[PDB]
Structure 1
Amino acid sequence: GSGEPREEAGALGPAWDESQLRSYSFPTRPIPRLSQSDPRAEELIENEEPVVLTDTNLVYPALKWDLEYLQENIGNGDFSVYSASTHKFLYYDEKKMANFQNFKPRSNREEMKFHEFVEKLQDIQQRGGEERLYLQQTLNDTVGRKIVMDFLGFNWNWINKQQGKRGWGQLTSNLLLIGMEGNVTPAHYDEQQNFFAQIKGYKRCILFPPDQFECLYPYPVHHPCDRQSQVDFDNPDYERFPNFQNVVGYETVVGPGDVLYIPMYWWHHIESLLNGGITITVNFWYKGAPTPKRIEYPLKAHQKVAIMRNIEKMLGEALGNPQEVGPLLNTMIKGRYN
């Protein structure tokens, strides 16, 4: 489980309840929820382990954000809005679809203005339709004046010190995430460090450390769903994915004002609570620190993941066709290493 639902101040009762969580096959234990001043919080971040920080004020000026405020102020730029007829919004790279022409995505991307996203959301809620939307858009220069001021008001002092102390590279982007209740982002890992800043509503975050690679079966590197798990968490195929019977998660529910550190290479499954209304999040993606000058043995799990990715990339290049990677790997191992 996630830990008991937090009781909201002013006696407003449990923020959420367990009936709002989807049911899965694996056990979990809770991610610690700590003050940013707690030395244990700094210890977790330094060791690249997840922690929920409850009091960073990282996106304090955004906590007033809702669809009306954003529509009035976020400007007239384009926003990427994914549409799906399922609750699962499985990420895929459009640029890799050529490699796998039999891959038929279950979500589609549409570019629209923010007011068109709000209108489409209202159309769906009015007709009781089953269509689902997930807006996922990096923040950029087109945002209006008040959003700029809100952004400038983030706690750059706190997060700049984190970047510096951890040796991270540049902030590459901030993804604005606006989802419908029940939306799910299936398990994947990212190759950047992430401070995940919850703004509105509640998201259940289930994390798995990099040493559970063997249990989570990422797609081939050249597949559009590179870095995502092949396992259907709602109907796990234990014949193809037997070590998913061994997966163990680290779980929490973040709400407004919480910040989850999702360390680079950690798997994460994210869901907007059932019947919890819309969710809003802004993430902070940083490039990881460079490879160290001296390598220490034996290697860490994330180092072996980096090696495996590079082997797949190099073979795809050397063989001239990413579809030849699997046959070559099988030829190498069968009756030799297995």
Structure 2
Amino acid sequence: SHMAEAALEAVRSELREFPAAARELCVPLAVPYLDKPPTPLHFYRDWVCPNRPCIIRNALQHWPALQKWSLPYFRATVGSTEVSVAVTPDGYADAVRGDRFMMPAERRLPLSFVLDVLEGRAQHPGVLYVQKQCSNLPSELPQLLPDLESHVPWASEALGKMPDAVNFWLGEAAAVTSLHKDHYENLYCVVSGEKHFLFHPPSDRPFIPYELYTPATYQLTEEGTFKVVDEEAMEKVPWIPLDPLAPDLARYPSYSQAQALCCTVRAGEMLYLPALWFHHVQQSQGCIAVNFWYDMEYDLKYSYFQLLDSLTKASGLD
């Protein structure tokens, strides 16, 4: 029917207009800074409920980590501790490589070897990143807990809950985190160096491509090479093929209608990365960071994003 076709083009048109309408109301042109930690209520009303990012300054002054932490300090304090290390040939763990979703090779290594690689004292095949997540800071590096807080009190009070995980990040500058989103409210604390975040708001979903990929894992051979081993037990994983830094607009032309939001988080600063926001992460050499993950609330904003996601696919936009 011709009337049916007109209704579908009106739907597709509304979906395509939504990211611009939403960003005009809800999304800042630049990530704003706070000069000091907000009150819990201010945090909930100004940032959490509206689901929008900010960087908080002067929130890590109680952390001994801010003065002490460095690669030599780590060597002295936890250098012999065994940690899960992610390894990839090119620095892209959990990323689309060709026709597969590639997961990294996980290797258990003393932290001193990571420090050696980062300081150029040693050579290793590929790119190293201590990225395990899964609350790896209390689990693998408990000796470091005295150097920081077990949670961000004003944020825990605001969200009415405690952190579900506290993660330690340490990697080469070549280790890049490709575009993805999380089901968590994220307080990302850069202790040393700098992180470069590229964001897309949830409302850009109509212009963010997703594809289904066979999952596979890198395997490091004794000869210093990387094998691709398929994960037969996993179902195909949906992932964003697109590289926000050099997007393949010939394949995904509609991505040009998305709009990226960029910011840099420096030592001493805390990024609030709101739940469901797409993000892509780069780092300076041996950047040290800690992030607190608080579980998001499964509320109206979550239901709406599920609708937006489903409609993006049902309508043919993705």
Q: CA 1:32–1:308 in 2, change beyond 3 Å: closer, same or farther?
A: closer
- Aligned residue among 244, 261, 264 for 1:250: 261
Normalised by the length of structure 2, the TM-score is 0.69
Shift of 1:190: 0.5
Name the counterpart of 2:303.
Answer: 303
Distance 2:102 2:162 in 1: 32
- Aligned residue among 70, 77, 83 for 2:87: 83
Check the 8 A contact 2:79/2:112 in 1, yes or no: no
Structure 1 unmatched runs, 5+: 1-27, 93-101, 312-328
Shift of 1:91: 5.2
Distance 1:217 1:107 in 2: 23
Q: CA 1:197–1:240 in 2, change beyond 3 Å: closer, same or farther?
A: same
Distance 1:170 1:222 in 2: 35
Distance 2:113 2:278 in 1: 33
Matches within 5 A, 1:97-176: 103=100, 105=102, 107-122=104-119, 125-126=120-121, 131-137=126-132, 138-141=136-139, 143=141, 145=143, 147-151=144-148, 154=149, 156=151, 159-167=152-160, 169-176=161-168
Look up the SS of the partner of 2:51 in the other structure. Answer: coil
Distance 2:50 2:288 in 1: 28
Structure 2 unmatched runs, 5+: 1-27, 217-235
More strand by share: 2
Shift of 1:247: 1.8
Shift of 1:228: 4.4
Check the 8 A contact 1:45/1:51 in 2, yes or no: no
Distance 2:59 2:204 in 1: 30
Matched, 1:44 2:44: no
Name the counterpart of 1:60.
Answer: 63
Q: CA 1:223–1:303 in 2, change beyond 3 Å: closer, same or farther?
A: farther
Amino acid paired to 1:186? S
Distance 2:112 2:122 in 1: 18
Q: CA 1:144–1:164 in 2, change beyond 3 Å: closer, same or farther?
A: closer
Distance 2:101 2:179 in 1: 19
Shift of 1:187: 1.3
Name the counterpart of 1:280.
Answer: 288
Q: CA 1:70–1:290 in 2, change beyond 3 Å: closer, same or farther?
A: same
Matched, 1:217 2:214: no
Look up the SS of the partner of 1:60 in the other structure. Answer: coil
Shift of 1:61: 1.8
Distance 2:253 2:70 in 1: 43
